[PDB]
Design a binder for this molecule. Structure first.
Ligand SMILES: Nc1ncnc2c1ncn2[C@@H]1O[C@H](COP(=O)(O)OP(=O)(O)OP(=O)(O)O)[C@@H](O)[C@H]1O
Ligand SMILES: Nc1ncnc2c1ncn2[C@@H]1O[C@H](COP(=O)(O)OP(=O)(O)O)[C@@H](O)[C@H]1O
Lengths: 518, 523
């Protein structure tokens, strides 16, 4: 039922899997020209929840539909278990021949852990002969095509070590657990009478942090199930269905949100729904400046730079590391990010801090371009020992000059107050230091539109009130603004069940005048 | 898994390149007793029956073993082959392991002949979970009769982690070092893996290919040769994604794009310190690099290959920013190929191999003394000296006296402070009147050469072609006192101004841009 249309996000995995597995089986005479000798053993491995067997079934559909030029047999290495001496043994030679009498073919082996476990002194002589003669079945009945052994498992070490030898089972395909999620939401709701809004589904996928595929459909089914709970609360404690129209179970804005809150669900995090219209301008500005310094976000017509470096400096309480920098990291996605802070350096024992400080830089060198994050450099410099500072400096210096790896750091004290070793590390004469500024008047004006007023009247003079709140908030930092918002929004809850107005507005207007934060 | 592995008949000593002295000595231990059974009984010989392979991974450690197994099994069918890998769900678990080893040796004696191959012994017999296994292993290996006919072959990546009771003649008597191949062996490997190809590349093409590949080991060559073909195939037929096998041949521009898409094995785990001087900066420092190697032959006359040398030392001193320890030193290390290098730096003493820093220093000193000639490399000595405790300073200073006088071990060091500034103990190692101290410096011509094919040609890919010369003179005059980091920055700030004007077909709206930028640029 799936022909590469119920798969979301896997734009690059498909190209690799088809080119090195199916195409050599789809076009075997081509590789006779150069003698590539493609491997005869392939695997699907990764964390659970990646949907490994469905890909094999899709390959079966692709190969079977047509002229039957390449085939596929579906097999499981966990239901192929026979409690007899050698009866499950014939399954592979017949299968490696049944798929060979009608070759080419791809044979899937789900959970080979049971059919071919680790033969040992505790395992049955049955399974001992099974595994021995079984590896004899595969390494002997291969090496000329056109059978490519594809298997799946949850753990890589759950395989008999004699299987993974030269000239035997070799290849491994990494399946991992957000760009896939838009495609997933598009696909899995292909036939829905209450078709949700595209922004509705995008918010759904945004709020489904940590889910991998199956639970993505599970939440949708659960949302429908609780929709018929909420629209029809009388389903409990009622007689047989007498009059129920099964069309008012339509999913609206609040249905999935009440559905999401009924189960438990990196230094990059976008702003909240309340914070976005306050710092979005500054995030865009810093992104633009970074574009200017860092062009990656002999021969010409190729981007090049000289040691990408940048420092965020702002007065404490300006949210330069509390809200800005993780947001910038989130905005500059599709690049590897690697932090270096105290709980990641001292948070693991059985290792010297020097032992991990080299691994991050080495592996970020491997995957250039990469991002290294060092928050609160003004305090991180005074916690490490004398050797760590020197090791950090030498590791940073050993980078190539034209390597497009960016150093991102944030600070609280002004640049002129830092230790001198930091000072002769940034080039303020260049574009390497960015300043954070207080929000302007429009942002503060638009920060209070929702509560004043789009929900208070939900079942004048307050406008003067409104401007007074702004008339005092010219020079308050982010934390004071947000705490003020929370304290005002509390009173709105305080009189939910008071239809009579002019008494709640009195208490709001007297609390705002009473709010002293000098 | 005691069954022999069905090896291909295509590996018959014709797929091994540059390993000739090793094969020339291996065949007189295995083959000759069997093929000349009368000459070993002329008087008495009893040839040996065991050898160790040690060295970095990826140097054809197993390929020679498979080739030996196949080539031997030709006139004495069948020579048995047994393949076991160390640390394979068998260690740290007793007492099944001794039963397994005894069974393997019994069946091997039953076969007669056989070749037993223990791979990665480092995890089997470490330097009564572990005592009982090593004891029975060595008792069994001593219980082998002299004529055998059992030959035991061990492989490892580090020699330091083996029992000292095994390296005795009678168990593991002869040791073999498998180092990286040099340029000649690299060309030989290229010729071997490109044998069944009808568009045979030219010899000069192979020479330049061999020169363009440094720090590579066997598998890198295989991957590059196997993926350049896929690059050509991908480029030829993009409409097929019946097929025509007529024009899928490989050409240039396919080898270099192949070079782009992965990293060498040396940048993965080996982490070699020597790194080739960049093509952008080459015409700025090539003369200096050639000059240093000229002054290196005064003290270490092995570099021009009864060569007698006495304590070869060298130290290149300069200003903080002249690129001593950033560009020059890895280049000089690079040009001295065929000499093994061992590194002594902060990341190596401390991060890797978390034991006392007192151990790795002794290990690298002894290993360097064992395989002379070699280079011991300790850069940034004015910072290295002030991080270590007095114990390691004493250890290091005393280990440099135990080398024999005429042993060819070169010490390479770099520094930023002037000679008289360094602490007096370090000063009591370099004897400048002997010629052990080099001073580095920053000409008009060399930077002129650095600039013209950026400010003339790359900016000409309507053009005035007159004020470019004046701009070149102005900027060159302006750059009379910058250091290397600054000088290589102006190149990156002008080319970016060019990139920002990619589609500007009029090359006049940008001229004033540079004629203002170079005056708004400051050191
Ligand atoms: N990434 C995914 N995309 C789509 N459907 C998925 C995904 N992951 C899981 N599913 C669905 O949930 C089911 C559970 O997956 P499955 O049990 O095969 O994986 P597993 O956790 O490795 O377990 P096991 O190997 O024991 O079967 C799948 O059969 C499929 O219906
Ligand atoms: N000299 C060589 N000639 C041809 N191939 C080589 C050579 N050295 C290494 N290889 C490649 O390396 C692989 C074997 O590496 P191996 O010697 O097993 O390294 P290790 O023993 O450290 O795993 C082979 O697949 C082969 O293609």
């Amino acid at each position: 039922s799936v022909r590469f249309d119920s798969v979301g996000g896997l734009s690059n995995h498909i190209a690799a899997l088809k080119e090195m597995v199916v195409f050599p089986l789809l076009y075997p005479e081509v590789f006779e020209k150069f003698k590539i000798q493609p491997p005869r053993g392939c695997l699907f491995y990764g964390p659970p929840g990646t949907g490994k067997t469905l890909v094999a079934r899709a390959l079966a559909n692709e190969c079977s539909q047509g002229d039957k030029r390449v085939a596929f047999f579906m097999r499981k290495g966990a239901d192929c278990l026979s409690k007899w001496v050698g009866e499950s043994e014939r399954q592979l030679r017949l299968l490696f021949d049944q798929a060979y009498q009608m070759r080419p073919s791809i044979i899937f082996f789900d959970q080979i852990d049971g059919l071919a476990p680790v033969r040992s002194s505790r395992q049955d002589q049955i399974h001992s002969s099974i595994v021995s003669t079984l590896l004899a079945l595969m390494d002997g009945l291969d090496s000329r095509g056109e059978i490519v052994v594809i298997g799946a498992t949850n753990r890589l070490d759950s395989i008999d070590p004699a299987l993974r030898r030269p000239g035997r089972f070799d290849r491994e395909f990494l399946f991992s657990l957000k760009e896939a999620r838009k495609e997933i939401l598009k696909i899995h709701t292909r036939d829905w009478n209450p078709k949700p809004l595209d922004t509705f589904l995008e918010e759904l996928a945004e709020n489904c942090v940590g889910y991998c595929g199956a639970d993505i459909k599970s939440i949708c089914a659960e949302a429908a199930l609780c929709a018929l709970r909420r629209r029809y609360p009388q389903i409990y404690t009622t007689s047989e269905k007498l009059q129920l129209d099964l069309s008012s179970i339509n999913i609206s804005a609040k249905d999935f949100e009440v559905a999401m809150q009924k189960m438990i669900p990196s230094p990059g995090q976008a702003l909240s729904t309340v914070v976005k219209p306050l710092l979005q301008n500054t995030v865009d500005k810093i992104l633009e400046a970074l574009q200017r310094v860092f062009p990656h976000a002999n021969a010409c017509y190729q981007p090049m730079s000289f040691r990408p470096r940048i420092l965020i400096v702002g007065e404490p309480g300006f949210g330069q590391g509390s809200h800005l920098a993780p947001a910038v990291i989130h905005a500059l996605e599709k690049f590897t990010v690697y932090t270096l802070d105290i709980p990641v350096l001292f948070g693991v024992s059985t290792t010297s801090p020097e032992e991990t400080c080299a691994q991050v830089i080495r592996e970020a060198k491997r995957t250039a371009p990469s991002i290294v994050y060092v928050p609160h450099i003004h305090v991180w410099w005074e916690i490490v020992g004398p050797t760590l500072k020197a090791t950090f400096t030498t590791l940073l210096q050993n980078i190539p000059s034209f390597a497009p790896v960016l150093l991102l750091a944030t600070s609280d004290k002004p640049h002129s107050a830092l230790p001198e070793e930091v000072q002769e590390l940034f080039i303020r004469d260049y574009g390497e230091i960015f300043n954070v500024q207080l929000p302007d008047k429009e942002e503060r004006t638009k920060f209070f539109e929702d509560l004043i007023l789009k929900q208070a009247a939900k079942p004048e003079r307050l406008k003067n009130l409104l401007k007074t709140v702004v008339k005092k908030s010219q020079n308050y930092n982010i934390f004071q603004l947000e705490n003020l918002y929370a304290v005002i929004s509390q009173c709105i809850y305080r009189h939910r069940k008071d239809h009579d107005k002019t008494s709640l507005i009195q208490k709001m207007e007297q609390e705002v005048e009473n709010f002293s934060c000098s």
